[PDB]
Amino acid sequence: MNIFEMLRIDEGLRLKIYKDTEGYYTIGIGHLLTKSPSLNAAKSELDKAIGRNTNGVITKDEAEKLFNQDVDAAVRGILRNAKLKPVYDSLDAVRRAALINMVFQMGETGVAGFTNSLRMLQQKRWDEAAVNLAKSRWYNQTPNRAKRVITTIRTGTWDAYK
Numbered sequence: 001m002n003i004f005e006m007l008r009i010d011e012g013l014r015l016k017i018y019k020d021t022e023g024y025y026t027i028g029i030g031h032l033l034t035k036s037p038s039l040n041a042a043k044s045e046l047d048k049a050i051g052r053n054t055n056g057v058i059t060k061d062e063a064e065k066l067f068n069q070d071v072d073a074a075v076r077g078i079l080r081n082a083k084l085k086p087v088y089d090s091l092d093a094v095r096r097a098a099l100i101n102m103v104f105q106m107g108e109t110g111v112a113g114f115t116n117s118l119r120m121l122q123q124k125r126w127d128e129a130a131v132n133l134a135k136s137r138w139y140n141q142t143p144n145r146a147k148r149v150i151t152t153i154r155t156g157t158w159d160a161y162k
């Protein structure tokens, strides 16, 4: 198990524009296209992202290309972030995957915001951090995915995904 396979399980793969849980236009592996209510604004963005006139549909390769870009941007965002970097440095490899997952889903700014949990993560107070992370909209909105991430964080194993 690795971060790619972990995210692919969590986000799925869709070759046609779709709406996410929040209602936003998305494509491939959890790639947010736009927060705009317009399918046309989403088709525009998608065409810009792919470099071709897609008509709202892409290939698996295209989707994988986007995914590769997003994991990288996720990683670089963490390392560039003053609040995130130190948490990530302090973690083992499994737990790092978990933070990358959060970041990929909710943005760097989003995660950087979880001040109290970041502090518990750094002090390696696993159980407590798990309890605090569940007290969020994230968990309430996408509970099954959130539980998997929180379990990876608490345990440091890949059980939840096995």
Ligand SMILES: [Cl-]
Pocket: 049
């Ligand atoms: Cl892009």
Ligand SMILES: [Cl-]
Pocket: 141, 142, 143, 144, 145, 146
């Ligand atoms: Cl869910």
